[PDB]
Amino acid sequence: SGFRKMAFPSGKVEGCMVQVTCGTTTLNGLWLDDVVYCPRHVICTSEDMLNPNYEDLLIRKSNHNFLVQAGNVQLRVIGHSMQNCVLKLKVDTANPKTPKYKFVRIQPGQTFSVLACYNGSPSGVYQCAMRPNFTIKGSFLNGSCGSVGFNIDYDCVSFCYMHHMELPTGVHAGTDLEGNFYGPFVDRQTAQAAGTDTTITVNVLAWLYAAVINGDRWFLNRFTTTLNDFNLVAMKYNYEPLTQDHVDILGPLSAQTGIAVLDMCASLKELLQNGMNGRTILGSALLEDEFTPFDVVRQCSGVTF
Amino acid sequence: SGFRKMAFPSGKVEGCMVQVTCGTTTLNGLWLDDVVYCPRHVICTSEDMLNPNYEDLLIRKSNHNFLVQAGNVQLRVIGHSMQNCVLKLKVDTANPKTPKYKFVRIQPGQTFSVLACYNGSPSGVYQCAMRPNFTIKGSFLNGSCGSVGFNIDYDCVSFCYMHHMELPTGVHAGTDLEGNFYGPFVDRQTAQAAGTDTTITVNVLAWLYAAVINGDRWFLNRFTTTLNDFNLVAMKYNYEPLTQDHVDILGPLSAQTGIAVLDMCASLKELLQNGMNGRTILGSALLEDEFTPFDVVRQCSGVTF
Numbered sequence: 001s002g003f004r005k006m007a008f009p010s011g012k013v014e015g016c017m018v019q020v021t022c023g024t025t026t027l028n029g030l031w032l033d034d035v036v037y038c039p040r041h042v043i044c045t046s047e048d049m050l051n052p053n054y055e056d057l058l059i060r061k062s063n064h065n066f067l068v069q070a071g072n073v074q075l076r077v078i079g080h081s082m083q084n085c086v087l088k089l090k091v092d093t094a095n096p097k098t099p100k101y102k103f104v105r106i107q108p109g110q111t112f113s114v115l116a117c118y119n120g121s122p123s124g125v126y127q128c129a130m131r132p133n134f135t136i137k138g139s140f141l142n143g144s145c146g147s148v149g150f151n152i153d154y155d156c157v158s159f160c161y162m163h164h165m166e167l168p169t170g171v172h173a174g175t176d177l178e179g180n181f182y183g184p185f186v187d188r189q190t191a192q193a194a195g196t197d198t199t200i201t202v203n204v205l206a207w208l209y210a211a212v213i214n215g216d217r218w219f220l221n222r223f224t225t226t227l228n229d230f231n232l233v234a235m236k237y238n239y240e241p242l243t244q245d246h247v248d249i250l251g252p253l254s255a256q257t258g259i260a261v262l263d264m265c266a267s268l269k270e271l272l273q274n275g276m277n278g279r280t281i282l283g284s285a286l287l288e289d290e291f292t293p294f295d296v297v298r299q300c301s302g303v304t305f
Numbered sequence: 306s307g308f309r310k311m312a313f314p315s316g317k318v319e320g321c322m323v324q325v326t327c328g329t330t331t332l333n334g335l336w337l338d339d340v341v342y343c344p345r346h347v348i349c350t351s352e353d354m355l356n357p358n359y360e361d362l363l364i365r366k367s368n369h370n371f372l373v374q375a376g377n378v379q380l381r382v383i384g385h386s387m388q389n390c391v392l393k394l395k396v397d398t399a400n401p402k403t404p405k406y407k408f409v410r411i412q413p414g415q416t417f418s419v420l421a422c423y424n425g426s427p428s429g430v431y432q433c434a435m436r437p438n439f440t441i442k443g444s445f446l447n448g449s450c451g452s453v454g455f456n457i458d459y460d461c462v463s464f465c466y467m468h469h470m471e472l473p474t475g476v477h478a479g480t481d482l483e484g485n486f487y488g489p490f491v492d493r494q495t496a497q498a499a500g501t502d503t504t505i506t507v508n509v510l511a512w513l514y515a516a517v518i519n520g521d522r523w524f525l526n527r528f529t530t531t532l533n534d535f536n537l538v539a540m541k542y543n544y545e546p547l548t549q550d551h552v553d554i555l556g557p558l559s560a561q562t563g564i565a566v567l568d569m570c571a572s573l574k575e576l577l578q579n580g581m582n583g584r585t586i587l588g589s590a591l592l593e594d595e596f597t598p599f600d601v602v603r604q605c606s607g608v609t610f
């Protein structure tokens with residue numbers, strides 16, 4: 001029993017973290033096979049942050065201008081290239097600790113673990129969701145750039161996020177491992193606004209099922225609703241519209257608990273319209289939306305890796 | 306910026322997890338040097354759970370009755386002994402992945418990371434506090450027994466918790482790595498009550514400092530208070546009494562923020578007496594007490610390992 005924001009075991013990713021230095025700027029890189037991946041803004045100076053021309057700045061850099069350090073050993077950089085917003089540094093040694101891996105571009109509302117690093121060394125690990133507005137609410141200090149987000153399936157690490165920047169609002173923005181930003185953000189020090197941050201409705205429902213599984217059920221009500229009726233409520237409260245795909249994804253939890261998805265929607269509707277009256281659900285006084293239906297099944301079934 | 310419940314990187318502990326089977330019971334063990342540590346109730350059957358005589362049950366077990374498996378390789382058990390509530394299985398191979406480690410018995414209110422495991426394989430990692438009543442509110446399913454809790458200081462793993470049981474209330478109980486339970490709990494299937502679960506006052510204050518550091522400050526009030534006056538409020542709300550030791554431990558955060566500790570106590574007093582009026586602090590609608598002053602400084606300073 002019990003329900004916690006649980007990250008994946010981070011060891012397979014720890015063995016891939018390296019330090020990348022270019023000039024006076026150091027950040028984190030990801031060493032898989034003989035390629036080190038890192039944010040291209042490693043080539044930026046104080047001058048460059050406001051409006052960098054990355055192609056022009058890159059041209060002034062040769063292989064020997066990138067120092068890559070794994071622990072205390074120095075990798076030899078034998079090639080470099082820019083792919084969208086990431087740099088790919090070819091090194092002369094394949095990482096002996098390279099796990100089975102894939103690069104994946106995740107959908108908004110999906111979750112992943114972040115291994116926060118500084119100077120190529122791991123600091124901690126925590127679970128995140130890609131917000132509907134393509135930000136993440138992480139914990140990142142100066143130098144955390146190039147830390148990665150990932151999921152693990154048995155023995156395979158799916159890398160889905162590289163950290164690039166903090167917005168002036170204090171939320172975080174970054175790329176997939178092909179260097180394409182999630183959302184409309186760009187890697188320059190300019191004012192950038194995130195859009196409206198809506199709540200991931202299918203995730204809240206999954207967490208309500210997790211609560212029922214754990215015995216927390218004061219919120220189960222006497223009503224049902226319809227998809228269209230519920231979504232009238234979701235829109236007023238900045239919740240993502242619920243679709244039949246979402247209902248289908250909740251199927252396994254619905255079957256485990258015997259609670260029809262639309263019945264749980266009606267409970268959520270009453271929760272949105274009346275609040276929680278000073279009660280808690282799974283130790284929280286807010287409706288939590290950073291657990292997917294898969295996350296719930298994993299933690300309530302004990303899937304290992 | 307940002308503040309998250311952050312666990313330590315778990316790789317050094319992943320390399321120490323093994324599977325221990327005795328008869329039909331399998332759980333997790335911890336393999337350090339040539340010793341495997343695990344809960345002694347691995348020797349229990351269905352019969353034994355209500356009132357086991359562990360000494361008598363142990364006598365019926367020889368070295369070859371313990372199967373220890375690390376990944377898919379079998380360790381040879383060349384000795385066994387009971388130390389309080391843990392079994393120590395001497396194996397013929399020292400773990401090549403043994404990290405620098407220590408066994409530590411932590412104080413109530415201190416935090417640690419838990420690497421939840423099943424069948425010797427890691428499932429996830431999360432941050433926990435040892436409650437004042439010596440329970441932990443974890444996420445543990447059947448078979449999680451022998452999963453460990455730990456802190457890391459640079460290169461040294463301090464093991465402080467081994468999971469043994471779930472109470473009928475759904476909270477969790479376990480031992481240090483010498484097999485002494487935290488709290489009054491025993492390893493048998495009998496009704497066991499935790500006492501009153503009080504709030505870790507010094508941890509709430511630390512988290513309030515984390516909020517100020519992060520720009521969340523609507524709760525800073527115009528009052529101050531005294532230690533004795535504040536503690537009158539703490540007692541009404543089941544908060545741990547605050548001591549001058551606690552004030553001293555908060556010194557670094559007080560100096561970083563320029564907010565005297567007793568001023569923050571007065572803000573907390575108003576928060577306890579008036580609630581949060583539907584506002585949030587660091588994304589929470591409750592007062593969070595599972596961050597120590599050290600945890601806050603680490604996450605707000607970027608200490609790596």
Ligand SMILES: C[C@@H](O)CC(=O)N(c1ccc(C(C)(C)C)cc1)[C@@H](C(=O)NC1CCCCC1)c1cccnc1
Nearest residue numbers: 027041049140141142143144145165166187188189306
């Ligand atoms: C240094 C780099 O290795 C990693 C790094 O930490 N940061 C970073 C610094 C410059 C850049 C440029 C692309 C502008 C060059 C990109 C990221 C800062 C950061 O984003 N500051 C923002 C702040 C408001 C807008 C301007 C930049 C940071 C701090 C905390 C968490 N995450 C990130």
Ligand SMILES: C[C@@H](O)CC(=O)N(c1ccc(C(C)(C)C)cc1)[C@@H](C(=O)NC1CCCCC1)c1cccnc1
Nearest residue numbers: 001332346354445446447448449450470471492493494
């Ligand atoms: C099987 C063992 O390897 C690990 C294990 O998972 N559990 C365990 C089972 C028996 C025992 C005895 C000491 C009684 C033999 C100790 C622990 C159960 C558990 O505690 N059930 C409680 C339930 C109410 C009171 C009776 C025992 C569990 C489930 C979920 C989380 N944590 C633990």
